[PDB]
Design a protein around this ligand. Structure first.
Ligand SMILES: *[C@@H]1O[C@H](CO)[C@@H](O[C@@H]2O[C@H](CO)[C@@H](O[C@@H]3O[C@H](CO)[C@@H](O)[C@H](O)[C@H]3NC(C)=O)[C@H](O)[C@H]2NC(C)=O)[C@H](O)[C@H]1NC(C)=O
Ligand SMILES: *[C@@H]1O[C@H](CO)[C@@H](O[C@@H]2O[C@H](CO)[C@@H](O[C@@H]3O[C@H](CO)[C@@H](O)[C@H](O)[C@H]3NC(C)=O)[C@H](O)[C@H]2NC(C)=O)[C@H](O)[C@H]1NC(C)=O
Ligand SMILES: *[C@@H]1O[C@H](CO)[C@@H](O[C@@H]2O[C@H](CO)[C@@H](O)[C@H](O)[C@H]2NC(C)=O)[C@H](O)[C@H]1NC(C)=O
Ligand SMILES: *[C@@H]1O[C@H](CO)[C@@H](O[C@@H]2O[C@H](CO)[C@@H](O)[C@H](O)[C@H]2NC(C)=O)[C@H](O)[C@H]1NC(C)=O
Ligand SMILES: *[C@@H]1O[C@H](CO)[C@@H](O[C@@H]2O[C@H](CO)[C@@H](O)[C@H](O)[C@H]2NC(C)=O)[C@H](O)[C@H]1NC(C)=O
Ligand code: NAG
Ligand code: NAG
Ligand code: NAG
Ligand code: NAG
Ligand code: ZN
Lengths: 875, 4
């Protein structure tokens, strides 16, 4: 109405990217929520550095409307006259046109642009929004913001690109029963009415829009003080106050550890953490005001699992890394998003390893990032680490395994190759140089090149400007060659076109009889290299430290299987996991006969370590799911793997005894025993479940999930389902809530799963943040694999309307179709995609799941007989 | 961003 939409394309605002010549310096931002009305108003004054004659000024805005014709100031101070404003929908712009046009800001003076705006707090988890919780039976409110990547523009009009850094002074007018938080400490509070308070916060350092955050709350708090003397506090519902203790501990330990490690002071005078009762992501690193989903922040040692403990520790550590990597130094464009997320995914492990000594975190990187992303990045529908993004939907899509896990993995390779000492020193220098400014990937290589004089740019570029990774082919124990590793043998290894032609500079490390050597394998050595002691065995890629697979000669592989049978401790736990992971991926890729791979599992009755078991379980999970409906193969695979875990499952027993890693092992090992149909493990789950239903017994924390799942699956009925649903509502602990939702997803009853699906539309029962989690859980159920898939189809229009096509979790939901393995199922997927071809942030996930389902079909055709023979002959 |  006031800035009507116009389809006028003839101007620079048709460009997706903001212009070079318009630049903000300072934001004067005021918001006033009407909490009970689910509305807000605000004005913003922006100081602008103009560089080129322009008759239009434009910036980002979505959903929120401008309410008053905006007003512009010359650097002298005069009022610039305004002819019109109009919204440009296609690129999310509000555009203002001067009668005239004016000239650059030449001195220290700047233009001032001021605009009034009104928006909504309801129906969304992005921008500025309100949600509720219950305290002592009263419904309470809390409002907060969430912006990354392109939602700042929903909160208030701004120059919403990460490189358009400016300084912030924020003020909020709110009811006095509430406190107000932002990025910075509170400067001054003044009474507006006898009812309203205006809270003003002190000036910010230059920062990106996506990091700007404020909240209105009635939360209690748990406090700690850094070595720097700065208050670190976690805000938390009074009811849940006890569950903030652990996160408080970890924040102190990791904050103190990082400041020392990066040799840089934290830029702000305080740091706050707070979990919003309904929160769309896991956590967000807003400078000084880090927001969380409760499952990632709130932990009860009496109720939560070690899995939960580690998740809390890791996400806090992750979010703290961003205070240096991401906040102080930010990427110039989202194409370089890995400079934020990859670095956070790397240092999170260093952080938690300091805080928790016997968690073997450095090894756990293999389980969390390296090996899983090696699956992802073996598909044709992967993408290079540096990713071309041209729409908001494309931007939000690349918050994925490549940015995080491959990013983490190639940094891990880099540190080892370049040595930790020099890696550290290089990071510091990068951090010194670009502080409060923006960097490109090139800027980071050059930084480390100063620390090593090694050819970092030349080597790392190959891991960074093309998708995929290599397999190393072993010829004659000692000669290696490189070839791109793709899961689909039929795929064209040269597509999509890459300047580097899918050859890499691979820093290669190996172990000759306990002694370790190093070589860089040049791209230009087209016919491979030879590794420099009259040897009979060569352990290549120790601890799977490089981002590649090693394919030994078959005879070698055969001797490894024998060596594992004789004395498995010959190899380190990581090395075992790695060899196993490679073998099975190689087999999957038709690069290694499956008999060779399966031979490596024969030793397992004596396997006792976490890492190998995790990668074995991952590999078997895939094979077993491909044979679910095969009445012939399944029992035989079940029977075998049941026999292989049985000793360790029995040995560890159904009880929380031992150190961290041991307790995690028991969880996954007992779970696998249950999965494989071990009658005695299932009976343990059923017995405990039956006891839990008596309403007193508090289950051992690391067994709960297994007990809810297998307990419900084996003896669940309407009575226990209803009970479990009540218990889910009643517990305050989000970590317990989540386990209970998985439990409810486990019942073997179509009617009850149908009720559960219907609950997804009920926001009094399932929170908006949790809908996709629940859908995914149901999809794992033997009945619900198809129910969830059908439901998202029938309710696609409803989901799009509720979440929008820009929602990451909605785009990814199609991956529930991953276990599909027939031409029928593939046709269903394709028909549904063709009916709803606007995929938004789901465009890549659709590509990926189709490639996966196609590979499954092929895989069955190629391998069913081979895998049959191995099992038939054995059993 | 953790994506959860
Ligand atoms: C929870 O799981 C446990 C397995 O981890 C079950 O414990 C096992 O029960 C079996 C049946 O009583 C025992 O079988 C006996 O095994 C010993 C071998 O050491 C042999 O003497 C016998 O062949 C066999 N018994 C007979 C009469 O033939 C297991 O030994 C036993 N214990 C362990 C540690 O595995 C629990 O029963 C199960 N709990 C529930 C409530 O179901
Ligand atoms: C690597 O895998 C190979 C392929 O499975 C193994 O070689 C196989 O060992 C099987 C025993 O586990 C043999 O099964 C036998 O098959 C014959 C008919 O061909 C039957 O009469 C026997 O009953 C059956 N054995 C049993 C116990 O039921 C296979 O014959 C044999 N295959 C070949 C081609 O040699 C290797 O042993 C394995 N390498 C290892 C473990 O290091
Ligand atoms: C928040 O609530 C308001 C008030 O109901 C929503 O605005 C309404 O939208 C519907 C159609 O979606 C219209 O029929 C009403 O006339 C609108 N009311 C007003 C006062 O404009 C608003 O859409 C909700 N916000 C979100 C994000 O869903
Ligand atoms: C799935 O759950 C439903 C709901 O409890 C079961 O249906 C009930 O069956 C009993 C008798 O078997 C009746 O008394 C209830 O009134 C039924 N409820 C409803 C809503 O129909 C059903 O038996 C279960 N099915 C399976 C296969 O386990
Ligand atoms: C389990 O809970 C369900 C839902 O609360 C109960 O079924 C509903 O009962 C209400 C009130 O009696 C009816 O109006 C609904 O039509 C019922 N069905 C549904 C689908 O909502 C059910 O009685 C409970 N069963 C047990 C055994 O406790
Ligand atoms: C936090 O640390 C203190 C000692 O610094 C310890 O006594 C306490 O148990 C810890 N709190 C947790 C893990 O919740
Ligand atoms: C850097 O850290 C030290 C830690 O004691 C502190 O004294 C100093 O003021 C910090 N520098 C800045 C610019 O704040
Ligand atoms: C390995 O490569 C080198 C150099 O081309 C050669 O000397 C050797 O014969 C090759 N083959 C084997 C099996 O060692
Ligand atoms: C890679 O090959 C080029 C060829 O010009 C060479 O200059 C460079 O030093 C090589 N790098 C190595 C072997 O690390
Ligand atoms: Zn992050």
């Amino acid at each position: 109405d006031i800035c009507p939409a116009s389809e006028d394309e003839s101007g620079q605002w048709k460009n997706f990217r903001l212009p070079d010549f318009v630049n903000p310096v300072h934001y004067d931002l005021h918001v006033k929520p009407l909490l009970e009305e689910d509305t807000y108003t605000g004005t913003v004054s922006i100081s602008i550095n103009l560089s080129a004659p322009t008759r239009y000024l434009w910036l980002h805005l979505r959903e929120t409307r401008i309410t008053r014709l905006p007003e512009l100031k010359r650097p002298s101070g005069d009022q610039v006259q305004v002819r019109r404003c109009f919204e440009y929908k296609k690129q999310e712009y509000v555009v203002v046109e001067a009668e005239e046009e004016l000239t650059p800001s030449s001195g220290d003076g700047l233009y001032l642009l001021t605009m009034e705006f009104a928006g909504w707090l309801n129906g969304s988890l992005v921008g500025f929004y309100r949600t509720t919780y219950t305290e002592n039976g009263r419904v309470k409110s809390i409002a907060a913001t969430d912006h990354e990547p392109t939602d700042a523009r929903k909160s208030f009009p701004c120059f919403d690109e990460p490189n358009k850094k400016a300084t912030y002074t924020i003020s909020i007018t709110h009811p006095k029963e509430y406190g107000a938080l932002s990025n910075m400490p509170v400067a001054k509070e003044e009474s507006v009415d006898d009812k309203w308070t205006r809270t003003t916060f002190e000036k910010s350092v230059p920062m990106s829009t996506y990091l700007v955050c404020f909240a209105v709350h009635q939360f209690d708090s748990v406090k700690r003080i850094s070595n720097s003397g700065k208050p670190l506090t976690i805000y938390v519902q009074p009811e849940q106050k006890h569950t903030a203790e652990y996160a408080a501990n970890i924040t102190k330990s990791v904050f103190d550890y990082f400041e020392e490690y990066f040799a840089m002071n934290y830029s702000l005078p305080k740091l706050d953490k707070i979990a919003i009762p309904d929160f769309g992501t896991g956590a967000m690193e807003n400078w000084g005001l880090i927001t969380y989903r409760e499952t990632n922040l709130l932990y009860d040692p009496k109720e939560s699992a070690s899995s939960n403990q580690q998740r809390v520790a890791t996400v806090v550590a992750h979010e703290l890394v961003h205070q240096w990597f991401g906040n102080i130094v930010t990427m110039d464009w989202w194409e370089d998003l890995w400079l934020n997320e990859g670095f956070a995914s790397f240092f999170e492990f260093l952080g938690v390893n300091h805080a928790e000594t016997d968690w073997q975190m450095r090894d756990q990187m293999l389980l969390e990032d390296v090996l899983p992303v090696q699956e992802d990045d073996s598909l044709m529908s992967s993408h290079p680490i540096i990713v071309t993004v041209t729409t908001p939907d494309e931007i939000t899509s690349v918050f994925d395994g490549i940015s995080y896990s491959k990013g983490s993995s190639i940094l891990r390779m880099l540190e080892d190759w370049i040595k930790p000492e020099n890696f550290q020193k290089g990071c510091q220098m990068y951090l010194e140089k670009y502080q409060f400014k923006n960097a490109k990937t090139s800027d980071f290589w050059a930084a480390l090149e100063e620390a090593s004089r090694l050819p970092v740019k030349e080597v790392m570029d190959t891991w960074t400007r093309q998708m995929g990774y290599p397999v190393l082919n072993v010829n004659g124990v000692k000669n290696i060659t490189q070839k791109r590793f793709l899961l689909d043998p039929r795929a064209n290894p040269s597509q999509p076109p890459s300047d580097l032609g899918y050859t890499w500079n691979i820093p290669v490390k190996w172990t000759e009889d306990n002694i370790t050597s190093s070589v860089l394998f040049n791209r230009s050595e087209k016919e491979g290299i030879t590794l420099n002691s009259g040897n009979a065995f060569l352990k290549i890629n120790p601890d799977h430290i490089g981002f590649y697979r090693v394919n030994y000669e078959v005879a070698t592989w055969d001797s490894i299987a024998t060596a594992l049978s004789l004395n498995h401790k010959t190899f380190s736990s990581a090395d075992r996991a790695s060899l196993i992971d490679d073998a099975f991926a190689l087999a999957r890729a038709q690069l290694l006969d499956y008999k060779v791979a399966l031979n490596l599992t024969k030793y397992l009755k004596r396997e006792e370590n976490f890492l190998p078991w995790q990668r074995v379980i991952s590999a078997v999970t895939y094979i077993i799911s491909m044979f679910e409906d095969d009445k012939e193969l399944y029992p035989m695979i079940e029977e075998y793997f049941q026999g292989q875990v049985k000793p360790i499952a029995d040995s560890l027993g159904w009880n929380d005894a031992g150190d961290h890693v041991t307790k995690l092992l028991r969880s996954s090992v007992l779970g696998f025993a249950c999965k494989m149909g071990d009658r005695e493990a299932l009976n343990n789950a059923s017995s405990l479940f039956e006891q839990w239903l008596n309403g007193t017994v508090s289950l051992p924390v690391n067994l709960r999930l297994l007990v809810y799942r297998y307990g419900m699956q084996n003896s669940g009925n309407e009575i226990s389902w209803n009970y479990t649903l009540e218990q889910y509502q009643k517990t305050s602990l989000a970590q317990e809530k989540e386990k209970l939702l998985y439990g409810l997803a486990s019942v073997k009853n179509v009617t009850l799963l149908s009720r559960y699906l219907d609950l997804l539309k009920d926001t009094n029962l399932i929170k908006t943040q949790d809908v996709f989690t629940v859908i995914r859980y149901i999809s794992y159920n033997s009945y619900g694999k198809n129910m969830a898939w059908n439901w998202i189809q029938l309710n696609w229009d409803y989901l799009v309307n509720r979440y929008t096509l820009n929602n990451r979790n909605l785009g990814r939901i199609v991956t529930i179709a991953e276990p599909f393995n027939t031409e029928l199922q593939l046709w269903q997927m394709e028909s549904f995609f063709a009916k709803y071809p606007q995929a938004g942030a789901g465009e890549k996930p659709r590509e990926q799941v189709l490639e996966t389902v196609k590979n499954n079909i092929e895989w069955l055709k190629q391998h069913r007989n081979t895998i049959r023979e191995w099992f038939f002959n054995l059993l | 961003x953790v994506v959860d």
